[PDB]
From a paper:
In response, one family of large bacteriophages uses a nucleus-like compartment to protect its replicating genomes by excluding host defence factors. Here we find that the bacteriophage nuclear shell assembles primarily from one protein, which we name [name] (ChmA). Combining cryo-electron tomography of nuclear shells in bacteriophage-infected cells and cryo-electron microscopy of a minimal [name] compartment in vitro, we show that [name] self-assembles as a flexible sheet into closed micrometre-scale compartments. We find that the shell is primarily composed of a single protein, [name], which self-assembles through its extended N and C termini into a closed compartment.
Further reduction of the structure to focus on an individual protomer resulted in the highest quality map at about 3.1 Å resolution, enabling atomic modelling of the [name] protomer. [name] folds into a compact two-domain core with extended N- and C-terminal segments. The N-terminal domain (residues 62–228) shows little structural homology to any characterized protein, adopting an αβ fold that is topologically similar only to an uncharacterized protein from Enterococcus faecalis. Although [name] lacks the acetyltransferase active site residues of AtaT and related toxins, this structural similarity suggests that the jumbo phage nuclear shell may have evolved from a bacterial toxin–antitoxin system. The [name] protomer map contains three interacting peptide segments from the N and C termini of neighbouring protomers. The N-terminal interacting segment (NTS: residues 48–61) of each protomer extends anticlockwise (as viewed from outside the cube) and docks against a neighbouring protomer’s N-terminal domain within a given face of the cubic assembly, thus establishing intra-tetramer connections. Two extended segments of the C terminus (CTS1: residues 590–611; and CTS2: residues 622–631) establish inter-tetramer interactions. Notably, the binding of CTS1 to the [name] C-terminal domain resembles the interaction of the antitoxin AtaR with the AtaT acetyltransferase toxin, further hinting that the phage nuclear shell could have evolved from a bacterial toxin–antitoxin system.
Numbering used by the authors:
A (entry chain A): 62 to 306, 319 to 581
B (entry chain B): 590 to 611
C (entry chain C): 622 to 631
D (entry chain E): 48 to 61
E (entry chain D): 280 to 285
The structure:
């Protein structure tokens, strides 16, 4: 009766911290502690990185817990009952990392930290949990652990500085007064992006913001000084409106997966999040959201084929791409005749990701007991970013900011033949391609996602069965995420407010 | 009861076009 | 439902 | 560039 | 109390 994935991790982290301090990379001002599950009676053991300062004589402690799930032990499952006619049955669900980190868990962690550090009445502030995925060998993953430790220290410094109170980041200071301009570059990708711990993330459209400083006969050709600010990963999905059979049958919804800053920038502040998120709306400058749909020349993975859209069209068969006659001449005609011109913007909020502190805030703003406070905080932050007077473009009193669609998305990875990929590659188009002519199977798959009648546990069961049926037997789930839809007017108001606030971005 | 589609996705759609200096 | 978690803002 | 010097969070990266 | 622990 013992746990062996905590002591080894603690030893590795202590050695890494010693090495980093030796190389003059960090400062010996933080502590690393172990949260054993055996002597605290908690679901999962965790590692906490605590850094403390003093504010007006009151000690303040910032903590960044790291959950350590283990595959050698099984947590008890959750039972639910549903009724069908005269018979009742029991469904056995599964428990994720997110449900483990509850209020009681954080309370016990804070009490333990306060007792350990010698300060019983010290204030404790969270900095954002980040679980360490299982099936990861700690012996040969030193680089990821080092980067994660550095990022955790940076996050603790960020939250401490935010609590202390510093100058907000504003776009008025981005002028540079040196005759430079900001340019935004769009990009279409096919290989998934990677997290700080190697977790793949699906990313088809990437929007970045750079600084263009070409003044004159500039020297240092082919050399750039970290001219990059933001990066947003987006991918498009198709949704079908319930109309019986001039409006196009399908409507395109764009999902935002990851928002992050440049690698060089070591600071993360709330006003940077909105500035980075404002780049999402710029993807509609030249219908760039439709670029991944066009066929590529030479290869055909047959997973993202757009010809499947003809399965439910007036003609039963599928439209055949990869043909000599087919080109961009009638690809536009197809998109005009079967896709709505305007897209929809959605975000996949995750309470355990790197940007947990904003995903939780947006989830609270979407709906709950803390609905007014979150909206007021968001409005205050947006006012702080770029001067003020946001009331002229938006009115949070009588206008929702974020809306919850009641959809839960699993987070996992499946090992393709070549390399590990992301579980979110399976979408409506992928399912339509998988089920060639069987309309009933596609309708069942679509209902397994957003059926309001079905219990969420049953929908999750059907979604887990479909993934095994289509993708393969190598699927490995890692977490949970929730999908939300932004207000249509909010995005436009934010974009117009930033544009009027002296921000000028040029591109193709 | 059988699913038929999303009757609420069509309410939120961007009407304007991205504003860039170009 | 609408389960919530700790928030540093409030 | 100047952003890092304006905030100066402890812990060098890259 | 002590949920998720046996």
């Amino acid at each position: 009766g013992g746990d062996a994935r905590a002591s080894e991790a603690l030893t590795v982290f202590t050695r890494l911290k010693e090495q980093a301090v030796a190389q003059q990379d960090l400062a010996d001002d933080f502590s690393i502690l172990r949260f054993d599950r055996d002597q605290h009676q908690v679901g999962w053991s965790s590692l906490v990185i605590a850094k403390q300062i003093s504010l007006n004589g009151q000690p303040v402690i910032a903590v960044r817990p790291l959950i350590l799930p283990n595959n050698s032990i099984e947590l008890p499952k959750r039972k639910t009952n549903i009724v069908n006619g005269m018979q009742t049955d029991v469904i056995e669900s599964d428990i994720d990392v997110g449900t483990v980190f509850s209020a009681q868990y954080f309370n016990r962690l804070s009490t333990y930290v306060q007792n350990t550090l010698g300060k019983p009445g010290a204030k404790v502030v969270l900095a954002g949990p980040f679980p360490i995925p299982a099936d990861l060998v700690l012996k040969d993953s030193e680089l990821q652990l080092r980067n994660l430790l550095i990022k955790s220290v940076n996050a603790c410094d960020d939250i401490l500085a935010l609590h202390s109170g510093e100058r907000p980041f504003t776009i008025a200071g981005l002028k540079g007064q040196q005759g430079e301009t900001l340019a935004a570059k769009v990009d279409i990708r096919t290989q998934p992006l990677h997290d700080t711990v190697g977790n793949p993330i699906r990313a088809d459209i990437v929007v970045t913001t750079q600084r263009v400083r070409r003044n004159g006969q500039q020297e240092n050709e082919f050399y750039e000084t970290d001219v990059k600010l933001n990066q947003v990963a987006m991918f498009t999905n198709l949704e079908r409106t319930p109309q019986a059979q001039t409006p196009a049958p399908w409507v395109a919804s764009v999902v935002i997966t990851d928002v992050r800053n440049a690698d060089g920038i070591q600071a993360n502040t709330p006003e940077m999040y909105w500035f980075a998120l404002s780049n999402a709306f710029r993807s509609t400058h030249g219908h760039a959201w439709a670029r991944p749909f066009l066929p590529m020349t030479g290869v055909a993975k047959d997973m993202k084929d757009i010809g499947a859209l003809g399965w439910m069209s007036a003609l039963r068969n599928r439209i055949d791409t990869k043909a000599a006659n087919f080109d961009d001449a009638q690809f536009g005609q197809l998109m005009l005749s079967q896709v709505q011109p305007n897209p929809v913007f959605q975000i996949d909020l995750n309470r355990m990701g790197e940007t947990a502190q904003m995903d939780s805030l947006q989830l609270d703003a979407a709906g709950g007991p803390n609905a007014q406070k979150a909206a007021a905080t968001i409005i205050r932050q947006i006012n702080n970013l770029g001067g003020g007077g946001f009331e002229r473009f938006f009115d949070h009193t009588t206008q929702p900011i974020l809306e919850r669609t009641g959809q839960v998305i699993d987070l996992g990875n499946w090992f393709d033949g070549d390399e590990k990929r992301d579980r979110r590659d399976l979408d409506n188009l992928a399912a339509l391609n998988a089920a060639e002519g069987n309309e009933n199977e596609f309708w069942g798959f679509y209902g397994a996602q957003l059926n309001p009648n079905l219990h969420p546990d049953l929908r999750n069961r059907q979604s887990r069965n479909y993934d095994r049926q289509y993708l393969g037997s190598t699927v490995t789930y890692t977490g949970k995420a929730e999908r939300c839809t932004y207000n249509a007017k909010f995005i436009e108001a934010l974009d117009r407010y930033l544009a009027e606030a002296g921000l000028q971005i040029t591109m193709d």
